[PDB]
Amino acid sequence: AMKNKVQLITYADRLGDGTIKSMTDILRTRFDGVYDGVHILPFFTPFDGADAGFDPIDHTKVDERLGSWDDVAELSKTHNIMVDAIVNHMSWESKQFQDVLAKGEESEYYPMFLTMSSVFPNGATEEDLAGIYRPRPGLPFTHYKFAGKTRLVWVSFTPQQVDIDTDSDKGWEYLMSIFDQMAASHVSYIRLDAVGYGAKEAGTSCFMTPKTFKLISRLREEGVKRGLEILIEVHSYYKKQVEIASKVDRVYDFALPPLLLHALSTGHVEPVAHWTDIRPNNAVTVLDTHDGIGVIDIGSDQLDRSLKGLVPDEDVDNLVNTIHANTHGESQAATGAAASNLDLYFVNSTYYSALGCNDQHYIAARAVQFFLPGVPQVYYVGALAGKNDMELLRKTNNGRDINRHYYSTAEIDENLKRPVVKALNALAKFRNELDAFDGTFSYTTDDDTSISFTWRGETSQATLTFEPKRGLGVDNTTPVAMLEWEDSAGDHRSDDLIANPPVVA
C-alpha cells in the first residue's frame, strides 16, 4: 500500500538545476521530512515535445538530458517514487507509429493504433461521433498518411499523441513493457494517465464505460502482480469517480480543489461536508496539479446535464468568475480558448493565485486537504506558494504553463523564507509525524458554517476546525482554520497556522 506521507509532484527539470539528480538534491536538502515521496512527471524521451512529456517517443528511456534510470534508483533509497504509465497514446514520432506511416497495413504495428475505421468499421452516424466524450470541441481525429493513403487517426489530445488500441496484442505488449520497466527501476507507484479514455467502442461515449472498467481492472492486476500500487487519473462527473474507486488502489480527489475555492470565497462548507460524507477514502488528495483546475469536476454530468454536481452549475460559473477576478485577468489570458489547451473548461491558474495570494486561505486549504482521508500530494508550484507565471505563458502560449514555472535553486531558497511556505513545510511534517492520521477519522459540522475533522490514533489525536466565514475577502488576514492536538507532551493548539505552525513532540 501507499505510505501515508505527503508527496511532492514535480517536473525533474523545473525544480533545481534541471536534472533528476538536482531535483533529488533539492528534495533531500530542503524538504527532508516534508515530502517523503515524489511523483516525477514524465521524464522519458522526450520531455519537451508536444505535451511536456506526455507524448513519449520512447516511454522506457529516460530523456538523456534529464538523467538515467540509475538516478531514479538512487532517489528510491530515500523516497518512494510515483511515475506515469501513459496508457492511452504515444508520440507520432515513436518507432511504432513511424513504421505504420511507412508501411501501412503491412506494418506489424498497424493493429496497435486506432483509426476511425478501427472503431467504426461500417461507418458512423453524426450521433455516433457527436457522442464521443471530449475535453474540448472538435472530433478526436487527424490526418496521417499510411504508406501514402490518407487515414483518420484517433487522437484524444494533441494530434501528435496518437491513441493506441489497448485491446490489441501489440498495444498490450507495449503497455506491459512500460510496467516492466517501472517495476525494474525501483518505482513504487504508477499513475494511469488519461485512463478513462483508454477504451473505444462504437455507439458509446468511449469514456469511463463498462469496456473502460475492464481495461482499468486488467491494468490494476498487472500493477499488483509487479508490486506497483495503481492510481488512476479520471476527471469525471463525481459519481463516476465514487463508483470506480472501489476497483482500484487509489483515485484522485479532484472534487476537493474547487470545493475549497468555493468554500473560501463564499463561506459555504455544506458541500465540503457532503463530499466528506460520500467520497472514496482510498484517495490521493491534491489542491493543484500540473494541469488546470478542474472546476467542472464538481459540476453536472457533461453528457447528461440533468445529473447535478456537488454544487449547482451556477456556483461553478461563479467560481470561475471568482478565480478570474482574484487573478486580475491572469487566469482569463491562460484559460480555455485564450491559449493552447487540451481542456476547454479547466481554469489555468496556480492555486495560490486562484485564492488571490491569501496566505490564511491557502494554508487552511492545505490543512483541510491533509485532514481528509487519503495520501496527500503537493504540486511543486504550490509547495513554494507560487504565483501565476505570465512571462512563461507569453513565451509558449500554452495555457497550463501559467502554473509550470521553472524554479532555480536560488528562487527555491528565496521562497523558503516566506512565512506561508514555512507554514506549509511545518504542516506537512506534522501530517507525516502524528500517528493520529493512521487511525480513525470522524467529522462534525455546524450547518454550512463550520466543519471539524478529527483523527484519533494510538498515541495522539488531532482536530482541524474550518470556518471560512471568519475571513472572507482576498485581503483578509483572519485565520479560518484552527488546530488542536494531543501528543507525547499533552494538549496543544494553534489558532493561526502561519504565525504558529504545529510541531509534534
340 contacts 397 by C-beta, under 8 angstroms: yes
| Three-class SS state of 190 | strand
Residue 16, sorted as left (phi over 0), alpha (psi -120 to 50) or beta, turns out to be left
Q: Hey, what's the torsion of the CAs at 124, 126, 132, 135, to 10 degrees?
A: 140
Q: Hey, what's the torsion of the CAs at 82, 87, 92, 94, to 10 degrees?
A: 70
In angstroms, what CA-CA distances link 356 with 141, 261, 287, 306, 394?
Answer: 39, 11, 15, 33, 21
Distance of CA 455 to the CA centre of its chain: 25
Distance of CA 437 to the CA centre of its chain: 22
Q: Which residues contact 438 (CB under 8 A, 6 or more apart)?
A: 4, 457, 458
H-helix or E-strand containing 176?
helix 169-184
**Which domains, and CATH codes, for the chain?**
1-86+168-433 (3.20.20.80), 87-167 (3.90.400.10), 434-495 (2.20.220.10)
CA distance 106 to 12: 39
Which one is catalytic: 93, 233, 288, 297?
233
In angstroms, what CA-CA distances link 27 with 355, 376, 405?
Answer: 26, 16, 17
Q: Hey, what's the torsion of the CAs at 33, 39, 195, 339, to 10 degrees?
A: 120
φ/ψ (deg, to 5) at 215: -60, -45
Strand partners, 150: 145
31 contacts 6 by C-beta, under 8 angstroms: no
Question: Nearest CA to 127 among 303, 321, 254?
Answer: 303
* Whether residue 475 lies in the annotated active site: no
Instruction: Write the single-letter amino acid at 476.
Output: N
279 contacts 266 by C-beta, under 8 angstroms: no
CA distance 374 to 306: 30
φ/ψ (deg, to 5) at 317: -55, -45
Q: Provide the CB-side half-sphere exposure for 363 (13 A, CA).
A: 30
CA distance 330 to 357: 13
**Following DSSP, what letter does each residue of 205-248 receive, concatenated?**
-SSS-HHHHHHHHHHHHHHHHTT-EEEE-----HHHHHHHGGGS
Reported structure resolution in angstroms: 1.5
Instruction: Write the single-letter amino acid at 49.
Output: G
**Following DSSP, what letter does each residue of 97-145 receive, concatenated?**
HHHHHHHGGGSTTGGGB-BHHHH-TT---HHHHHTS--SSSS-SEEEEE
Which one is catalytic: 63, 84, 193, 330?
193
In angstroms, what CA-CA distances link 190 with 44, 82, 227, 247?
Answer: 14, 6, 10, 15
Reading the block at residue 442, the C-alpha cell is 470522524
Scan for cell 503537493, then name that residue: 378
Strand partners, 369: none
CA distance 472 to 436: 30
Reading the block at residue 504, the C-alpha cell is 509534534
* CB-based burial label for 314 (10 Å; 0-12, 13-18, 19+): exposed
Q: Which residues contact 317 (CB under 8 A, 6 or more apart)?
A: none
* Whether residue 193 lies in the annotated active site: yes
Go through the chain and list every residue after which a break occurs, taking a C to next N gap over 2.5 angstroms, comma-separated.
Answer: none
396 contacts 339 by C-beta, under 8 angstroms: no
348 contacts 487 by C-beta, under 8 angstroms: no
φ/ψ (deg, to 5) at 362: -70, -45
CA distance 293 to 346: 5
φ/ψ (deg, to 5) at 46: -100, 165
